From a paper:
Here, we study the RBP presented on the surface of rodent-borne paramyxoviruses Mossman and Nariva (MosV and NarV, respectively), viruses that constitute founding members of the recently defined Narmovirus genus within the Paramyxoviridae family. Each protomer of the RBP consists of an N-terminal intraviral (IV) region, transmembrane (TM) domain, an α-helical stalk, and a C-terminal six-bladed β-propeller head domain, which mediates the interaction with the cognate host-cell receptor. Crystallographic analysis of the C-terminal head region of the dimeric MosV and NarV RBPs demonstrates that while these glycoproteins retain the canonical six-bladed β-propeller fold found in other paramyxoviral RBPs, they lack the structural motifs associated with established paramyxovirus host-cell receptor entry pathways. Additionally, using an integrated crystallographic and small-angle X-ray scattering analysis, we confirm that MosV-RBP and NarV-RBP form homodimeric arrangements that are distinct from those adopted by other paramyxovirus RBPs.
For structural studies, minimal constructs bearing the C-terminal six-bladed β-propeller head domain of NarV-RBP (Glu184−Pro657, termed “NarV-RBPβ”) and MosV-RBP (Glu202−Thr632, termed “MosV-RBPβ”) tagged with a C-terminal hexahistidine tag were generated. As a result, the MosV-RBPβ structure was solved utilizing the single isomorphous replacement with anomalous scattering (SIRAS) method with a platinum derivative, K2PtCl6. As calculated by the “Proteins Interfaces Surfaces Assemblies” server, the association between MosV-RBP protomers occludes ~2,070 Å2 of solvent accessible surface area, and is stabilized by 16 hydrogen bonds and three salt bridges. Electron density corresponding to a single N-acetylglucosamine (GlcNAc) linked to residue Asn319 of MosV-RBPβ was visible in the crystal structure. Despite exhibiting only 31.4% amino acid sequence identity, NarV-RBPβ and MosV-RBPβ present similar overall structures, where structural overlay results in a root-mean-square deviation (RMSD) of 1.6 Å over 401 aligned Cα atoms. Indeed, while the HN-type RBP dimers typically assemble with a 60° angle of association between protomers, with ~1,790 Å2 of buried surface, the MosV-RBP and NarV-RBP protomers are organized approximately ~90° relative to each other. Fc-MosV-RBPβ bound to all cell types, and to a lesser extent Fc-NarV-RBPβ bound to Vero and LA-4 cells. Additionally, CHO-pgsA745 cells may also display cell-surface receptor(s) targeted by MosV virus only. In particular, we note that recognition would likely be sterically precluded by the extended β5L01 loop of MosV-RBPβ and NarV-RBPβ, which is not present in the HNV-G RBPs. Second, MosV-RBPβ and NarV-RBPβ maintain low levels of sequence identity with MeV-H RBP at SLAMF1 (12% and 9% sequence identity, respectively) and nectin-4 (7% and 10% sequence identity, respectively) binding sites, and further, lack the β4–β5 groove integral to morbilliviral receptor interactions.
Author numbering:
A (entry chain A): 203 to 631
B (entry chain B): 204 to 631
Amino acid sequence: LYTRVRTFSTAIRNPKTCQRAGQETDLNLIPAFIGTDTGILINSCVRQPVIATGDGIYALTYLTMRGTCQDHRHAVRHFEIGLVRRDAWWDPVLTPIHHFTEPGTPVFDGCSLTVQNQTALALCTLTTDGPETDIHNGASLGLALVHFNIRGEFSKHKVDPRNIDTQNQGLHLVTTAGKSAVKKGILYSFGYMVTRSPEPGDSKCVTEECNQNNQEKCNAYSKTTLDPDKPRSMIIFQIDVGAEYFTVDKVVVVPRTQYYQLTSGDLFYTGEENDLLYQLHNKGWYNKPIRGRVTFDGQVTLHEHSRTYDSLSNQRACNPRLGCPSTCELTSMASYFPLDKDFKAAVGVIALRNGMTPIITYSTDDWRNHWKYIKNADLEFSESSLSCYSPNPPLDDYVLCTAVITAKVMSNTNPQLLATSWYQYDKCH
Amino acid sequence: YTRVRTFSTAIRNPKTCQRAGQETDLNLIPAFIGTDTGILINSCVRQPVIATGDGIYALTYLTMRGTCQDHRHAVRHFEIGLVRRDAWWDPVLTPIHHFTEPGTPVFDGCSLTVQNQTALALCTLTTDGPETDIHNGASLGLALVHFNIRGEFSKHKVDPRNIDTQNQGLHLVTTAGKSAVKKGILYSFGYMVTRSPEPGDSKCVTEECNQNNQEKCNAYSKTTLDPDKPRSMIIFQIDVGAEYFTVDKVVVVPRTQYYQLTSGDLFYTGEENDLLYQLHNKGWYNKPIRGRVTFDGQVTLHEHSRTYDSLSNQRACNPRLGCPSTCELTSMASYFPLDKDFKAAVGVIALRNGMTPIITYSTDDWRNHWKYIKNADLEFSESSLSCYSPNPPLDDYVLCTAVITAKVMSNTNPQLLATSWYQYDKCH
Ligand SMILES: *[C@@H]1O[C@H](CO)[C@@H](O)[C@H](O)[C@H]1NC(C)=O
């Protein structure tokens, strides 16, 4: 059988109160030989990467298309599960053991991903041309729960979205790509919901001096409508995947007061009795990290942390500048992962400047301890997913992180899948 | 498992019609196989071998951090998967199970073939690589590796004491390439360190090179390790399920049959047909080296007269490539038979300067056409190529998949890339 290398998420740990030191030496990057070839030679497009780790196990998912990024009809959904194994340097590295593909059509879109014990769980949307195009065309959408385990078993189960409690407001339910979390047998994941009535209230905005009515621009570009007749709200799905008592599958609205533009995100497990953490993905005009704590009692609140030490940018400036509400959209996102259950310390993968040059950033509160290169080159990347994990028993000064990015390799106009891991400094003083 | 049934193009009768060059552009399709191999960290991938069976493929390769000369810390990868219809209804390769064996010792020089639902690899167990181990006075092991589409994996040490060498073998080494199974016997290339030097001249050329070619051919033939260690090319014969009693053995490929000691591929053509072969261009000889293998009376490599493809380096050699020298091609060529005679062939080769991977398509000694894998200044080092027909076959095409080790984004080491294509196969 396989020997297990025990690991756990850094996000379940108590925060360190000591000053976290910047690492003086350069990064020890180590192999993450996961995923597949994704068509660097033929300029294929990889979208929606999500990585998740458990106890000696990781899982990975992504969507591939030939030639363009706008061909959902002929896309292929990839799923993968693998192990943490000691290599010839005795480093714990990720390596795949089973891979699965599901070609369209319909295709699995916007899959979330988590690892529970020996099983990966993905909640996905069944679509022909992509959810927004299907909804516009008057088509319906499906949902699916996919699981696969380290034995190589694979299951896909349709979930009737009409039987999910939406307080009779939901017309369409859509999952979006990112990390999910399971607490007390309930699977939580981000998505959005087309509703009968528009959601009242102002979208979250900024008081930055932008030579305009910010709140007006914020509402206008909030992406809370798919059409004059199609309002949509951000949601968190709650699916019973093993609750102690019977629970009704439901969605809960994330009110538009809680975010700037409707977007995807990650939910980070911190323990059975601890609040989930979150990050929203910078895919619009807001160019600072969007992360913090989620609570549900009475209503869904995104308790957003005050974070300014990292800034996202595009190669070409926007008018008004990024950070000001506009129709500009960041071409390159950032992934953050909590080093503790409060998100006090964070690891990030982000572009250095101009939407290129992947770097790792390392913060405590609103202070950047250091940054290091993944690759000091003019390499653009579009999407990312990041997971950090500690061996058990832990190392004194380090944890481990793995990132997947979709990068425009060798002057390709589309992005392909690349991966890397590193020893992540975790040390006091 | 649900899969597109396939068979190797090398078992077919040669087409009696004239083969046309393809006027239309190449239809390249995804080969999303293997893993990330450290493009971001300049890892080194070596010894790639791909093999196909009936709706099944297998892949193997060796990875190292930072340099290509770190056998002590290398990792051997094995992979098996299926031929499946994608959303365009094209038959594409997709992995189902992956395996790694980190050093040390590591599996070096693995050959690879697919027998029914099981991949077979014959490998050499080594610490610092076979030549370094031999130089250091260490011994080597052999191993037979099996892994199947259900995900089962087996490795068994093979004691060289059970391999008949007519009491001449001192070390046995497998080299990376395609193997073949006929009538339950596994055949694969390798080399053998012997007690006594092999007599005879190395195969040579008569090209005017302003030198004594035969003397240079013998001197640069790589038939000696160190100063006192002669070695001979061999073909292993290992029982993997023969119906009759056989002794596992090596058979010498005499030095008259090849230019420099090197690795190669053996191509199955049917239970009752001669194997085909190719030797890998890793030295000064810069034309294809391929043809038919026979065994009745020790190994004869019946080398075809092939000149339509020529390999080149970015920096010229003095004397020029094609002339015996100590210069070595930085990029190899992979060929695959489209029939049991190797009459028609698919090739993967660099266009010029050891870069720009292209596909060539030949009949006899004529290049019908060539097509780009990538029209870019992309250096690549090693390759493996397999072509296969869906069953029932297509009228005008077959399918091919290649893996190459390419120096991506100004990396000094090469990483694993893959692609497939519809290969023109049409008459007139
Ligand atoms: C973890 O998974 C294994 C295999 O699926 C199962 O047998 C075991 O009971 C699980 N343990 C828990 C605590 O759920």
